[PDB]
Design a protein around this nucleic acid. Structure first.
Ligand SMILES: O=C(NCc1ccc(F)cc1)c1nc(N2CCCCS2(=O)=O)c2cccnc2c1O
Ligand SMILES: O=C(NCc1ccc(F)cc1)c1nc(N2CCCCS2(=O)=O)c2cccnc2c1O
Ligand SMILES: [Mg+2]
Ligand SMILES: [Mg+2]
Ligand SMILES: [Mg+2]
Ligand SMILES: [Mg+2]
Ligand SMILES: [N+]
Ligand SMILES: [N+]
Ligand SMILES: [Zn+2]
Ligand SMILES: [Zn+2]
Lengths: 368, 184, 368, 184
DNA sequence: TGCGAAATTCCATGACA
DNA sequence: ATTGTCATGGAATTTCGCA
DNA sequence: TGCGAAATTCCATGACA
DNA sequence: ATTGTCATGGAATTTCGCA
């Protein structure tokens, strides 16, 4: 502060104040003739207040804050002090956007067998049809085979009714769902425990995690729309038709329909495939097992050039779920406890809780 | 001649009337001929209408080439014939008073009747809720003639609910005594 | 049809039926032994119905439709007949998504002078503050200088009141707005004609076109949020502060604040720049003119690898504005009358009208 | 000594009372010293409060280093001094009964008074709506001493509303006669 | 042993509240 | 304590029919 | 005539209803 | 009859201080 600048005026060298410039006194203030012009060198004890005042004008970032300061002042390593304040400004930290993308998506392994993993979700509300407003959609992970049920609400009770009918056929090892009200109730947990079914939940506010069923929702809505063109949207009576239609549609990348992957033989539907007509059922089931294991599986895409990946102990911030008007889009900084996988982490959060959270709902805190 | 396959033939039949359960009185029984796989549907009547409503569910999962039945009224009506024609399903009738399926199906229908009776005693009014577990049981039951359950033959995998206890299926002395009480 | 297939059975060569395969009769139907197995060759007069029936099962595209047909049939150039039907299926054409991206964005020239072009827009509704719910935002194109006005509605009347106050200072050549109710009313058109101001409108449903002001809306909301952290959202009394704060913030790419670009000298605000202290106003205005012309201007980015660009006479489809539940997201095909620029076109539309429309709200009709 | 600049000095003053227009009675007049640029604000009173409300608008566009005024009550109050201190604005007062600006400002204030009078006759009650056009006129008026309008000096460009007619500014014989009528 | 054309595979694009 | 997916239709690449 | 470090510039990322 | 924009903060690149 006063000592440093004093020793400077009488011509001695202080580290980080370049020797070739001339430092003088004027109007009670240390100055220096720099190429851009004459700037005031404030005492070090004054610099935090200056940086802060500059920053607070419009809560600007590194350069825009620096450019204000540089108008009047010069000191050694200015940006270092600017960044110091940026990393301490609660308001900037929780309001600003990130400028670092998530690391590339995982492509989880396809469930090995039918009934290994169900993905379930609700679509709706849809226009009232026979008093119904929603559709429960159940997609078998391995096969893509889909079951559709009309409901009046996305309720636990309607979910249970529907799955009682479905599990008449078979019981799945795992049911994966998002955190919809219907699936996270303790009634639904009981229903599943009663049957030795493990409930698996998506990280919150991250529909990609139910991608298997979500993607089917698209086709479901797309076919319904086409069938309803120029008619009133009486969708109820078409659910069954849509279900059958989709279960018997080819995926061009796989060369199989979901019905085929589930049963290894077409039923009596139009354009049924006849290639296994001369095989025994046993020969057929054997070819099916071979077909199931050799299906195309996609790989993790290349990272974008400025992605980040979570590291244990990192300061990160969770996206505010439904941010109110003119309120921060981010929570206060929290710490990464565990890296479950490159796209999923446990954080010690804003409430002091462990939360399992998708990287897509996180930014790395800026300036450390 | 081509080997027998799932969906080649569904065998259908009604069971009931039964004691009312959630308002239902019958069970439509469907058995796949090749696999012995069973689907059950609760109905309020053995009518063409209830049969169509029920088979509409099943046939939104898989369509059989042939439906076999006896000459039940529900199945010989021209409405049901219309329905089947619409779906490219051939209809097949056993001659009156002479029901013929196959060994496999006969035996399955038998198990179905016996298993129902066994569980409806004590709770003759709670069968609606039990239909799911009944079907799983039936479909995960080892077939002596083939080396496999219907589940395995239908899906080509083991099941997550193997019914390792091949059961009594016979009524215990206590059940015979309270079956002669409820039917009195 | 019957003639073609006849001449085939008796061993003669017909174009497109490869010679090396053997064609026979069985069950009253022409067949052929192909590597995959024996397929029925239907008469040509039957093929449209077949393709159609296959397609209609689930309204599938090229491959998924083909794969059904191939299960039972073979004929020459099957996909040609499949594509024929696809291009004729009204329902697929108006329901399906595009799989071709828009060509790369234009970077219009910065207005040469302050007051050459205003960009205006509304933000809101915001939480009630002093009975106010919206903000009119006016951004000078050349400078970025921004004026903020609180309103109770996004109305023509409130717009007129606000711009009467603003145009006290200067009158702009052009005011660019989106198609908000407030700006497209005939009252507002009169107000502008009265002043010799030309009204310029964005293509409908394309906020990028008001990008200049939209982008300012972001900073406006971002600063307001920061200032309101842990206080009730009393934003009204902060509009003026925000206006001044932003007008005096540096753009790091330009190295100038909008105030500087408008006046060429800082007013009495914190960290005012003093570099022109020794210039006359005239010397200063001369440096300003030089500064205004030499500003960084960005260029059109590279096209994505599968973009399309409009060509006069092309069949294209306009995105449905607010599509109802389970209704097509696209209008019926329409024709490109004129290509205004690579990102903007006039179409002869679904109503028989000329519409000026952004490429972003268009897809090229598939299959021609 | 450094050359004179915009924002160096704002000269402020009230004009009125005037006939009521949309409930307003005064005009706060602000003139930039260097450029001669004029901003006008309608008020209901020549009070510290109305001055603060009005200058709050202007100072959300540009802040002057110095505000010059006479010793009006509104401008000498400790509230107004607080306001100016808050904003780093130096306050400057002409000595009582002896108003001094600059040639440029004096002349501008003159034009302002005269131009107002000219247009308020015939429509003494419609001046509120005219303030915008008044200001444009004033700010796009050629200055004999400098080669430029205030607009040009403030923004460094030509304006889109040049007032090519340097006007009468004098009252026509008809207006003198109906000015002596309205003020009777 | 190489050509033109058809068939198949590749894959960016967009949408699942 | 968990994780994107896949129909789509032009273009790129491979295969086919024939020689 | 070349080094280490600071300063400046580059620019992908995301959000404006 | 019209058209994206630009604050942001790490990384890449250039300049600076000194020799
Ligand atoms: O179906 C979804 N589709 C969107 C989607 C699907 C797939 C994909 F890749 C991207 C987007 C979906 N979205 C939900 N959200 C509602 C919006 C606020 C938070 S959210 O979590 O984003 C949601 C919430 C609760 C229950 N089920 C939900 C659900 O099913
Ligand atoms: O501010 C806008 N921000 C979004 C935005 C801004 C910039 C950018 F690049 C992307 C997106 C905005 N959006 C409007 N739309 C409402 C949603 C349905 C049709 S829409 O046209 O998309 C809108 C409509 C009417 C009037 N003003 C509008 C408007 O200002
Ligand atoms: Mg959901
Ligand atoms: Mg019978
Ligand atoms: Mg708008
Ligand atoms: Mg006075
Ligand atoms: N996995
Ligand atoms: N342009
Ligand atoms: Zn801040
Ligand atoms: Zn179609």
């Amino acid at each position: 502060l006063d000592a440093e600048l004093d020793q400077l005026l009488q011509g001695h060298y202080i580290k980080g104040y370049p020797k070739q410039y001339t430092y003088f006194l004027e109007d009670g203030k240390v100055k220096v003739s720099r190429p851009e012009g004459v700037k005031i060198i404030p005492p070090q004890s004054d610099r935090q207040k200056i940086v802060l005042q500059a920053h607070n004008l419009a809560h600007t970032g590194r350069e825009a804050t620096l450019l204000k300061i540089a108008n009047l002042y010069w000191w050694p390593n200015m940006r270092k002090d600017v960044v110091k304040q940026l990393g301490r400004c609660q308001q900037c930290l929780i309001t600003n956007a990130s400028n670092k993308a998530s690391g590339p998506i995982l492509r989880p392994d396809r469930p090995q067998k039918p009934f290994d993993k169900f993905f379930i979700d609700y679509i709706g509300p849809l226009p009232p049809s026979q008093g119904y407003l929603y559709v429960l959609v159940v997609v078998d992970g391995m096969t893509g085979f889909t079951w559709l049920y009309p409901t009046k609400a996305p309720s636990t009770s309607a979910t249970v009714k529907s799955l009682n009918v479905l599990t008449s056929i078979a019981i799945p090892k795992v049911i994966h769902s998002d955190q919809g009200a219907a699936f996270t109730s303790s009634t639904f947990a009981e229903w599943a425990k009663e049957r030795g079914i493990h409930l698996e939940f998506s990280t919150p506010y991250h529909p990609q995690s139910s991608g298997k069923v979500e993607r089917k929702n698209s086709d479901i809505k797309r076919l319904l729309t086409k069938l309803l063109v120029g008619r009133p949207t009486k969708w109820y009576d078409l659910l069954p038709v849509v279900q059958l239609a989709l279960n018997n549609t080819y995926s061009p990348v796989l060369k199989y329909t979901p019905h085929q992957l589930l049963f290894g033989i077409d039923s009596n539907t139009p354009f049924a495939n006849q290639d296994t007509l001369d095989l025994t059922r046993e020969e057929e089931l054997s070819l099916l097992q071979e077909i199931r294991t050799s299906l195309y599986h996609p790989s993790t895409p290349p990272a974008s050039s400025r992605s980040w990946s979570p590291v244990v102990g990192q300061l990160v911030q969770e996206r505010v779920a439904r941010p109110a008007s003119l309120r921060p889009r981010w929570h206060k900084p929290s710490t990464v406890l565990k890296v479950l996988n490159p796209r999923t982490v446990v954080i010690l959060d804003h409430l002091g809780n462990n939360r399992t959270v998708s990287i897509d709902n996180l930014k790395p805190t800026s300036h450390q | 001649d081509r080997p027998q396959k799932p969906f080649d033939k569904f065998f259908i039949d009604y069971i009931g009337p039964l004691p009312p359960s959630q308002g239902y009185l019958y069970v439509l029984v469907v058995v796949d001929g090749m696999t012995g796989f069973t689907w059950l549907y609760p109905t309020k009547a053995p009518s063409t209408s209830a049969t169509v409503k029920s088979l509409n569910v099943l046939t939104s999962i898989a369509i059989p080439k042939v439906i076999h039945s006896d000459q039940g009224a529900a199945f010989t009506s021209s409405t049901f014939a219309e329905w089947a024609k619409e779906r490219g399903i051939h209809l097949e009738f056993s001659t009156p008073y002479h029901p013929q399926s196959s060994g496999k199906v006969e035996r399955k229908n038998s198990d179905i009747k016996r298993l129902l009776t066994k569980l409806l005693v004590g709770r003759p009014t709670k069968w609606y809720d039990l239909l799911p577990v009944v079907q799983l049981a039936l479909n995960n039951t080892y077939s002596p003639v083939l080396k496999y359950t219907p589940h395995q033959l239908l899906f080509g995998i083991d099941s997550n609910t193997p019914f390792a206890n091949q059961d009594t299926l016979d009524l215990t002395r206590e059940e015979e005594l309270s079956l002669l009480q409820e039917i009195r």
